[PDB]
Design a protein around this ligand. Sequence first.
Ligand SMILES: Nc1ncnc2c1ncn2[C@@H]1O[C@H](COP(=O)(O)OP(=O)(O)O)[C@@H](O)[C@H]1O
Ligand code: BEF
Ligand SMILES: [Mg+2]
Ligand SMILES: [Zn+2]
Ligand SMILES: [Zn+2]
Lengths: 89, 126, 139, 206, 411, 48
Amino acid sequence: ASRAKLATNRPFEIVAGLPASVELPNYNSSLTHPQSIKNSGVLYDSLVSSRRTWVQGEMFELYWRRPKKESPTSGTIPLIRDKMQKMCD
Amino acid sequence: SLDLSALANFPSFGEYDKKIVHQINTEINKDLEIKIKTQPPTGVFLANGIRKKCLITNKECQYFDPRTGVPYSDVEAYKIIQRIQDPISKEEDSDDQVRFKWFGFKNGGIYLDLSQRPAKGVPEGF
Amino acid sequence: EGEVTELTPEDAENPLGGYGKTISHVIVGLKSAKGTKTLRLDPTIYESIQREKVSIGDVIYIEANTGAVKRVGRSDAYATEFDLETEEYVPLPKGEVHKKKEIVQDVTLHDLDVANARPQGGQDVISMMGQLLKPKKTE
Amino acid sequence: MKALVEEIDKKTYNPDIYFTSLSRPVKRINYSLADLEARLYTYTQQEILQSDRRFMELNTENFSDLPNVPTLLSDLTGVPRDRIESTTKPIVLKPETLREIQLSYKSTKLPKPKRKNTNRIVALKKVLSSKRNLHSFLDSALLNLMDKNVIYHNVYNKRYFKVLPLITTCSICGGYDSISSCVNCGNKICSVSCFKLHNETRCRNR
Amino acid sequence: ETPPIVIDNGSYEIKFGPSTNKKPFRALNALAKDKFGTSYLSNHIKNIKDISSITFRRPHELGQLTLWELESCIWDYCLFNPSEFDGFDLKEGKGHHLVASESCMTLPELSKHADQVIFEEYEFDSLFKSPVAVFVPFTKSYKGEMRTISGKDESDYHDFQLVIDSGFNCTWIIPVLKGIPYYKAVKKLDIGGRFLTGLLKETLSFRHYNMMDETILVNNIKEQCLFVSPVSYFDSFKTKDKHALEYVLPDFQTSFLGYVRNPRKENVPLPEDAQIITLTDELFTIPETFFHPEISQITKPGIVEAILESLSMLPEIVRPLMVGNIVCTGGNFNLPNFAQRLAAELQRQLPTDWTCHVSVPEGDCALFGWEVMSQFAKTDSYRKARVTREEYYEHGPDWCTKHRFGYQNWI
Amino acid sequence: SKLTCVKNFVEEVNKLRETNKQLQEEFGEASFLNFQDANQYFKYSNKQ
Ligand SMILES: Nc1ncnc2c1ncn2[C@@H]1O[C@H](COP(=O)(O)OP(=O)(O)O)[C@@H](O)[C@H]1O
Ligand code: BEF
Ligand SMILES: [Mg+2]
Ligand SMILES: [Zn+2]
Ligand SMILES: [Zn+2]
């Protein structure tokens, strides 16, 4: 959210922190000095974001999370292990 | 000399196509040196010598794409990235080809193929 | 002659190429009433530039005959850059940046004799002390 | 002539800083709650924005169109209207227009009418009954982001900004023989008469 | 068979007439109303007596012709009425070949509307329209009389030419390559005649009594007496008294329009009741905004910056020829010493190897666009390029503006 | 004084001059008219 508030009238919008538009990008019409994808990395940022989100997104309802650390809360780890049965990969 | 041949290719008060604009941008880009402040990360290795893990497959990265700068584990990974690029698959059933689109989710975004056949039973308008 | 627009000293392509600073050619951009020209200069000419204390915008004057650099002054374009400053503002040189002229002068034989007898060259302290001396005629 | 011996204080002396200084006469103080609020809250972006707004104001011909500038400037630049309205300090069609056109019809005499109907003719009426302004066109979704940005912005210069030299002139009369900056706001003056004029009419700190 | 009709839809004056005609007509494309609500149209504006506060409504909001209603009114007045315009009369429009002009960068929707209305409503047989810079290279087809100046001293169209179109709205830098402008290198200088008239208003109102409303008075001043400094701003400012001029204000009982006098030259005495405004610095300090926008506190880059950028964005092999073949046109260029100074500055900026040859038409430079457009219309290139009424009918309305004429085809 | 290199300058000047003579033969009637062809301008610029 703290990402730089884009200057007015850019041919893109910042969606999920990245430059995007509803229509297919027309770089050739719109850009005079396009930085390479190497230079931009936008694709890279998108891919990393995608993977991470898939690791952390809302697709499936969360039910257990490893507790962020003679606290008996350690003893609950085997209990949570036993409350589930183990199945193949 | 080759530019002179290119110049003869330029539109001559006719009905010429957009492709010229690519050459135009090529000439325009020459205006000034590029003040790229920070070079982008490159290569398939981390600073400690451990191989990077593929963002697509989670396999250990073997090769690095010099054009885009996205390292990739396998040919499949590279092909998938390229299909993410080249949104108009210029084969010219064309609409049935894998078309990945990006959807914005809380705190991030994901790529979704609108040509993905959903599970059997989806209603009309699904 | 002209007004300096750029001054980008370059070093040798390899550090082993030269000694110490290893300063290679310097590139200078001069502006005149008829256009601009980018020159490639010897490191000696760069040393002359450093001696004359030339900055960007100063009107300069280089003689390819001897490699002597003269600082005419500051361009009248930058006259009002500062509202109080001691600078001899000079106009932009007319004509081309690189003008070749044939010079004709009448000199007496006695002039050559005097030049040999009492040369004006030298920048040493001994030279300056001799310069301060009266020019007494000698046989 | 020149003092060969100088006395110095190690606390006050440095080559970095050289400094020397001397109906009730007293320095003015500004009770501007807005300016104080700005101070506590905080060319520059505001300066260039003000200059651009002044340029656009000076471009327009009719005085009556002056209070319509902020909307057009917000549409052209893309900036919010409230920001330009508040931070920056400055300085259409009706049926009556149709009636004036009917009065204007008296000059033309030749054309003759006809009749037909189709949806194409309906759209023909629709273009000739738009009554919408350039602001509507620029805000209209039919003008795409790339099209708009190319057409307005790409024709503007982006790399060269000043290659001729910079020339400063008197703020009153454009003179250049002598220049100095007024103590009150730092705008530049050339003569005593111009100083009196700046003090009476011009100076912006009062 | 009929000669083509050519109209130049200026944002300030409209130059039109049959291709057979020698010199075009004039049409002030502006709807006016006076303080008492009485409305004046086109050349009636020149007939106003209550100059003081006449308000001008125009179809070009910001150089883009948005409001059709008054455009249609002005078109109908100029096309139909023969009595004022030397008997010229567009009877009913059908079966008439029309070549027009428009702003070089028009919105696709606006151009679509323009083509649609001009085709369906007017029912012309064929139509061409494009910026004047498209017609400029065609000047080879006729024996023009255009004076030229070089900056280094004191098959019916030219392939390489650079066009500076300085009109009422804005100053355009349009490089045309073999008759199609290089649209990605097209650069706009926002300074233009409207801005310059506003700056005249401002400086007159500051130095003398408030003339902020006296639109036609300041316009007549601008017509009578402006010039760019022959060498530099300093040179003109040094001899301000020697080149000083005084403009006589309009006297409603004798002359609704004012006039300029040269104080040094011998001339008739002015009546004691006539108010006089002397001009000693605004003659040249106002036009100098073109080269030094800082003078009138404008942050935009100036004309030399814009021209040099446009030259830079061009292909390297062709840019020197473009430098040598730069041609100036438009209403603003008619003011004295603009072409000479622009040429001098351009040569001073460019490398010594290249040479710039500046050619500007003699006489009123505003009429040049109509002349070159007409001389192009009478060539085989116009016959090949022109699009017919039925061909438009065959295509959907966006097709014409997106392919034949508008920028969209390339970009 | 014995090792002066005037011959080197003269020889290179003659090799340039013969190349220029061949180029002028190829071009034909040289002129300083306003250029309307890339080839013509390039050849004139090379000549100068
Ligand atoms: N005699 C003149 N002196 C100075 N400027 C003039 C003169 N005649 C016309 N102009 C300028 O020409 C402009 C009109 O040019 P025009 O060809 O109508 O341009 P456009 O195509 O933008 O409408 C006016 O704004 C005016 O400033
Ligand atoms: F009609 Be113009 F060129 F403003
Ligand atoms: Mg025009
Ligand atoms: Zn002053
Ligand atoms: Zn002040």
